[PDB]
Design a protein around this ligand. Structure first.
Ligand code: HEM
Ligand code: HEM
Ligand code: HEM
Ligand code: HEM
Ligand code: HEM
Ligand code: HEM
Ligand code: HEM
Ligand code: HEM
Ligand code: HEM
Ligand code: HEM
Ligand SMILES: *[C@@H]1O[C@H](CO[C@@H]2O[C@@H](C)[C@@H](O)[C@@H](O)[C@@H]2O)[C@@H](O)[C@H](O)[C@H]1NC(C)=O
Ligand SMILES: *[C@@H]1O[C@H](CO[C@@H]2O[C@@H](C)[C@@H](O)[C@@H](O)[C@@H]2O)[C@@H](O)[C@H](O)[C@H]1NC(C)=O
Ligand SMILES: [Ca+2]
Ligand SMILES: [Ca+2]
Ligand SMILES: [Ca+2]
Lengths: 149, 146, 144, 148, 144, 149, 146, 148, 146, 144
């Protein structure tokens, strides 16, 4: 099955904690910037969705702060995999934050899913792409409930 | 017999001997191993659930349904209306199978040995004999269980 | 006291210890907000949309998650003034239409401080470093 | 098939919080009446399927025994989540019992799943909707296998 | 929220966990009444006969035992409306000549709730179920 | 000796917890109703002492609530066997509650003691009548301090 | 009917349940606790061995004499001549006491709950019921044990 | 005889809270003076029995040594509660010492028991009046055995 | 000798070696086993407490009284008035027994060996020799203990 | 209640348990003074020289050490009236030029009592003995 199991949840949190920097943004920023670099290269029209946060300038202070926000959001969801009742509430809040921004669709989330799958093995030790994707998709499924394809 | 105090006692000892999870299947296997050891002829009555192999999924499923039936009936010991309705329901299912009521006597003795062996020396055999009669009477209607 | 470079390093390490990886974050956030609404019960009305009446609900626990995540981003940025001020401006806009008083920011400050001390121990809690650096954070959220 | 061993362990533990051999039958049919009252509010045309067990009076012994029978079957499936072979045969038996009843649609079991996902958190400490979804949905589909 | 059938079952199980078999009942009752008299110190005067001045005495600990026993009977009767209302009327007559205010019943409500949560954990405490069903109990003791 | 020892106290609390229902009155009521049935059969004039709680109607709501009160009182005393200082205070409160109700005497408590000794083995597993009675009498001794024989 | 195979089974299960050393006294105390719990009025029949206090040396001596009687009778199950001689000797000791034979039915049930509770789920209740009847028939002569 | 092993364990532990080889003698006779002052208030005619140890001045070395002797004997009996054979001989010796004193009535020991039951909870954490009663009463009767 | 510091030291080491509960009786048995091993003639002086059997309740009671006497005397080391009054009391009890004072020397050496063996290498023998002299002088009055 | 000879012995043993040998003295003193300044925040100004603004500093922790040492000397002297009154007069002169109110001595009394109970347990805490004997101590420090 493709369900994000309890076992898969434990594996994703290990894959994430082994790479998370709890005190400094050096690791978080490098992970996030590399993901959006990958996303923009594969979806060139995705850069326009981030005009308010200087998507064209990945090293700007505005996009660095956006990257930390996205990484903070993913950190919160991965940790809340242990408490899915609260996770469902948090994923709804993230859904509305992405909701009805014209070009923000389910296709963009499938693209960034492949972005993480290419970035994570370069930074994470013992990366399990199967278990990561089953729970990453579980998270993005809640984030894109009311989005177009 | 089988007064309200014996019904509560039987309810407590059953819950202890029955357990949770996979111990439920182990209890059920011991019950039916004893039934077929007490009366090996009864085994041929359960070919429809593949009793020729007692670890097959088909007979394990039958075991689960039977002990699940004991659990729900015992749980309704304190409500006559619900208890008798379910016992009538079990009777309508067993009647077309033309079962010799003597095998319900065998069942009870295998149940007593299994519950008592799991629960320990404080097993209340007179309470279990009295209250099992109420169950077998409801399912069979045979005067042997009065 | 001032939130200097040494204080920022200390607050970072003590926060990382108290905030942790995720297991104790629910209890951490519950301790903080139970203190907030006990000291300032009048503040619950601002949290109607996230069930401020019942901090045990999944709805409020997700709000507590977002607040602690916001603190985590600020603490992690304390050694990066340029990006810190940008993120503080984002938190400022997230509170601009809500009328949060300076007294209420101090109430949450004290609750976060009691929560961190409760998590890491009075034996090591650096009150001066935490008060000075939380002042830097909240004054930036207040557009100051 | 079905769900993982760690997910099943969570479902089994949380289910045994509110249902076991020591729970009185009154609590059983109280839960049973809440579940079926909620089912009839979602799918009102399904209430007629229970005329044979006196659904017109959900306080009768006949209908009380029905919900006790239903929750016992649900308890049986839950406690055999880590025995995929037996659970397959158990759900096949339950499926045949429901297929042979004229009027049962597969969407009635979809509605039953939503009723359970709504009622159970009101009874269970730290209800895990993910572990329950991973285990109950294959359980539901296996029991609803064959219904139109 | 309402004290429906599902809430009554939940309050029953959580109470049985917090109340226990007898070993932790002394600490349970002490935590509750230390909260009552801290929030409402003016209430101690009503308990002169049972040493409300000193909740550590055997005299008050026996009163705390009777109060928790009264709660146990009500909780155990939540699924039996007819017998519950009869027992609530008995508790009503036991308080009729004492002038207990509705504000004081709410103070004990919150203390019992904090006591139950302290015993079973914020992680599982169902605040809505407890508040609604305690309202049913106290409003019946108030002859309402 | 006939003293209720610490060992006897542990045995009575096990005999009681094994039969106590912490969530529902089904067990408590059945135990209590069976005891008063036994008492009334053996002491027919004892039924008149319970006119205010409908002693003649054991299934009435008034007597069901009385039974739960008595069982609650016995539960409190058995648990307080672990803390006899508080127990002494609680038994005094129970004594005054039974005090100088005309027909409530020490003989009625000796009768209900035999009632429990006949009811308990039918509902309790591993019932120790010796240890039960030594601590049951310890409890009733405090309850009947100021009562007539 | 208690045939030779049932007699062998009962001897086997008795030896395991009875045990060695102080396990025998513990087994005996459980048996008589169950007897007096199954029939509280039977306790008055044993004033001559101080049944008021089951921990007294007088009653613990009676317990040891009874289970010693059970042990020796069960061991003689395979020899009709020796077994019936001892059952008649036991009958001569019990007959003058004018005992209601129904108490020997209660005794049997307490024995089953004790041996089965100690031996486990493979306890053979039908074999024990059939072979205890032979013992009760030998001691009482009452044809309710026929 | 005497009291059970679990009751004796409670009495011995609670007694060693306030009396042991490490407790200063001043604390010993402070307790001793409180006990005998309470005894003389209950039975005032018993104070004359202690003229030989200068009871007229309860701050004297003679009377201080008396209460130290009395509490040491009580400590000796308590610490031998689980040795019924020795405790019997110990109490028989103490009984003979008190029988040979003209004027001692058995009710003076009853009053001493009530004094102890009153004073000890003021000194001991979680005083157990049941365990103490079960152990001290046979101790009292054994020491008072023979007095009129 | 036996100054206030030595009295406190002796008080601490005694409390440690003396212990609580049944270890008190074990300490007393070792003390008197050493007394009778150091001077086997002294055993005949205690026939009134059945010293011919040292585990008899009579001699165990004597052991308890003696070590209880040591405990109370040591406890009063800091109060001369109470100490001397009790030592006079012990002297009046021992004087009519016509005891050779040399056996009080034996007692002290057996006490030192028993306390030191229980307390360990930090045992302060000079302090114990000095302060035991104060005790034996009070009980006997013999100039051998000056 | 009165601080009689039996109460003095009980307070001595319970204090020795709560005060301990030294390992738990830092936490013991922190619990007490966090309670003092929470109930009476206006009292912190009297402790400017010892950093009453921050009880986590080594400066205040050393003041807390001196206060608990002063309590230890009084408790250890409760059975020696002559020397106790002399030491109480010394503590009196150590506070004479500071204007400590009788209400403030009661606040520290309650904090020491909560601190002792928190250390040894509500199960054994003797409130009557502690209140009466602390009254003897503080009334002597107040020159009374
Ligand atoms: C796991 C994947 C993702 C996570 C956790 C995530 C999380 C977040 C968070 C936390 C914010 C900040 C919202 C706020 O603070 O107001 C944000 C903003 C945003 N996200 Fe995502 N996001 C994800 C994927 C995506 C994808 C795939 C797209 C588009 C294809 C997208 C589009 C946007 C946009 C347009 C914004 C607005 C930025 C702004 O102007 O502030 N996100 N996201
Ligand atoms: C208290 C005793 C018993 C109880 C509670 C009980 C209960 C049950 C239950 C729940 C079922 C499954 C009904 C269904 O869902 O289709 C069943 C089926 C059956 N029972 Fe019983 N049973 C008992 C004793 C017996 C005995 C003694 C016999 C025969 C000697 C027997 C023969 C059967 C047979 C042949 C089936 C059908 C198996 C199949 O599905 O092919 N039962 N029983
Ligand atoms: C002191 C540091 C604080 C931090 C780090 C913080 C962080 C946050 C964050 C991240 C959100 C989520 C915004 C969104 O997603 O739309 C939020 C929402 C909110 N905060 Fe704060 N906050 C702080 C202080 C306060 C204080 C002191 C108050 C009031 C006393 C307050 C009241 C609110 C309210 C009313 C909301 C909106 C809740 C809703 O979604 O309905 N915040 N805060
Ligand atoms: C987890 C979900 C369910 C479980 C475990 C379950 C199980 C059962 C069981 C054990 C029986 C008794 C079979 C027998 O002994 O004869 C039964 C009967 C029945 N069930 Fe279900 N069931 C479920 C859902 C549903 C739903 C959603 C419907 C919708 C209509 C339904 C309709 C019926 C009917 C009509 C009967 C027969 C009633 C009668 O006896 O007259 N079931 N079910
Ligand atoms: C909320 C649930 C409450 C329960 C279950 C409860 C239960 C009880 C019980 C069983 C008694 C013993 C009566 C007797 O034996 O005579 C009692 C006594 C008493 N209760 Fe309550 N009570 C509650 C609320 C309150 C409140 C809120 C107050 C005051 C703020 C209060 C004040 C008293 C007083 C003054 C007594 C008499 C004490 C005495 O014996 O002197 N009760 N209560
Ligand atoms: C262990 C034995 C017993 C216990 C624990 C017990 C306990 C209680 C309790 C808790 C009450 C409720 C008082 C109140 O809430 O105001 C009560 C009432 C009463 N009891 Fe008992 N009782 C015992 C035995 C007896 C016996 C043997 C008698 C008489 C022979 C008796 C006579 C009464 C009467 C007359 C009432 C008054 C009922 C009413 O009108 O409310 N009790 N008892
Ligand atoms: C069923 C198997 C039984 C066995 C093997 C058995 C065996 C014995 C034995 C060996 C003695 C000692 C005879 C002697 O040495 O004087 C004895 C005594 C006695 N038995 Fe049984 N017994 C059995 C059942 C019963 C029952 C059911 C009762 C009554 C309910 C009973 C009543 C007595 C009595 C009253 C005595 C006299 C005890 C005395 O005063 O010494 N026996 N039994
Ligand atoms: C637990 C209670 C008691 C204990 C353990 C106890 C023990 C003792 C002991 C060890 C002695 C010293 C014997 C000796 O070395 O010569 C003594 C002496 C004495 N006792 Fe007791 N005793 C107790 C109660 C009483 C009571 C209630 C009285 C009431 C009058 C009493 C009257 C005396 C007297 C008059 C003396 C002799 C005083 C003297 O030396 O002039 N005792 N007792
Ligand atoms: C520091 C050393 C000693 C102490 C503290 C001590 C203390 C005692 C005590 C408390 C008694 C019991 C008095 C009573 O209650 O009747 C006693 C009795 C006695 N002591 Fe000593 N003793 C010591 C050394 C000795 C020695 C060295 C001897 C002889 C070699 C001795 C010979 C006796 C005898 C014969 C008795 C009487 C035994 C009886 O009751 O028949 N003692 N002593
Ligand atoms: C109740 C028992 C108290 C004890 C045992 C105690 C003990 C002490 C001791 C030993 C010192 C050190 C004095 C020195 O070395 O100069 C001190 C200082 C002081 N105490 Fe207390 N005190 C008590 C109550 C209070 C209270 C109630 C207050 C105020 C609310 C207070 C305020 C102060 C102040 C202001 C100082 C001077 C701090 C400094 O050095 O700057 N004391 N106390
Ligand atoms: C519905 O049923 C309630 C439950 O009573 C029990 O079941 C009924 C069917 C009868 O068998 C009765 O003897 C049982 O005690 C009834 O109390 C209730 O009156 C019924 N409601 C209606 C409208 O008939
Ligand atoms: C009572 O005794 C008090 C204690 O003093 C000691 O004992 C007396 C008997 C003398 O031996 C003395 O030398 C000791 O220091 C005395 O302080 C007190 O004055 C005495 N009271 C009366 C009224 O005489
Ligand atoms: Ca601030
Ligand atoms: Ca309310
Ligand atoms: Ca004061």
């Amino acid at each position: 099955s493709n369900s994000c199991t309890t076992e898969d949840r434990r594996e994703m949190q290990l894959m994430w904690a082994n790479v998370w920097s709890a005190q400094f943004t050096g690791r978080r920023l490098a992970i996030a910037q590399a993901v959006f670099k990958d996303l923009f290269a594969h979806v060139p029209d995705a850069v326009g969705l981030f005009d308010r946060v200087h998507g064209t300038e990945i090293d700007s202070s505005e996009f660095k702060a956006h990257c930390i926000r996205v990484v903070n959001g993913l950190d919160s969801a991965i940790g809340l995999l242990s408490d899915p009742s609260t996770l469902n509430e948090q994923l709804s809040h993230l859904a509305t934050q992405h909701q009805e921004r014209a070009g923000v669709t389910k296709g963009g989330f499938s693209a960034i899913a492949q972005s993480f799958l290419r970035v994570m093995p370069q930074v994470a030790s013992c990366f399990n792409p199967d278990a990561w994707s089953r729970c990453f998709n579980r998270i993005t499924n809640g984030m894109t409930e009311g989005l177009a394809e | 017999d089988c007064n309200i105090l014996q019904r509560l006692k039987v309810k407590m000892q059953w819950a202890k001997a029955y357990g949770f999870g996979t111990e439920r299947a182990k209890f059920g296997n011991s019950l039916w191993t004893s039934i077929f050891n007490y009366a090996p002829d009864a085994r041929d009555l359960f070919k429809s659930v593949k009793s020729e192999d007692m670890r097959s999924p088909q007979f394990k499923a039958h075991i689960a349904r039977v002990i699940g039936g004991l659990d729900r009936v015992i749980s309704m010991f304190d409500n006559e209306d619900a208890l008798n309705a379910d016992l009538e329901h079990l009777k309508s299912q067993h009647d077309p199978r033309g079962l010799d009521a003597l095998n319900f006597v065998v069942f009870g003795k295998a149940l007593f040995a299994t519950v008592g062996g799991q629960f320990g020396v404080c097993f209340d055999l007179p309470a279990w004999e009295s209250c099992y009669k109420v169950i077998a009477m409801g399912i069979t209607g045979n005067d042997m269980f009065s | 006291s001032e939130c200097g470079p040494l204080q920022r390093l200390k607050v970072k390490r003590q926060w990382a210890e108290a905030y942790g990886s995720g297991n104790g974050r629910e209890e951490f956030g519950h301790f903080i907000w139970a203190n907030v609404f006990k000291v300032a019960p009048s503040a619950r009305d601002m949290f109607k949309r996230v069930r401020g009446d019942n901090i045990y609900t999944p709805a409020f626990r997700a709000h507590a998650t977002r607040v602690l995540g916001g603190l985590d981003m600020c603490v992690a940025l304390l050694d990066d003034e340029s990006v810190l001020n940008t993120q503080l401006a984002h938190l400022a806009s997230q509170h601009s239409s809500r009328g949060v008083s300076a007294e209420q920011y101090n109430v949450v400050e004290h609750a976060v401080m009691m929560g961190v001390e409760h998590e890491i121990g009075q034996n090591v809690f650096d009150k001066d470093a935490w008060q000075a650096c939380l002042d830097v954070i909240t004054s930036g959220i207040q557009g100051n | 098939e079905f769900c993982s061993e760690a997910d099943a362990t969570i479902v089994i533990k949380q289910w045994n919080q509110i249902y076991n051999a020591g729970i009185g039958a009154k609590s059983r049919w109280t839960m049973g009446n809440e579940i079926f009252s909620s089912l009839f509010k979602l799918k009102p045309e399904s209430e007629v399927l229970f005329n044979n067990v006196n659904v017109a009076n959900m306080s009768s012994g006949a209908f009380h025994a029905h919900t006790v029978r239903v929750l016992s079957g649900l308890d049986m499936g839950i406690n055999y989540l880590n025995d995929a072979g037996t659970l397959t045969s158990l759900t096949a038996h339950l499926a045949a019992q429901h297929v042979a009843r004229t009027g049962l649609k597969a969407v009635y079991f979809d509605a039953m799943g939503k009723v359970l996902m709504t009622v159970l958190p009101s009874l269970i400490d730290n209800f895990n909707p993910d572990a329950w979804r991973n285990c109950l949905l294959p359980l539901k589909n296996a029991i609803a296998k064959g219904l139109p």
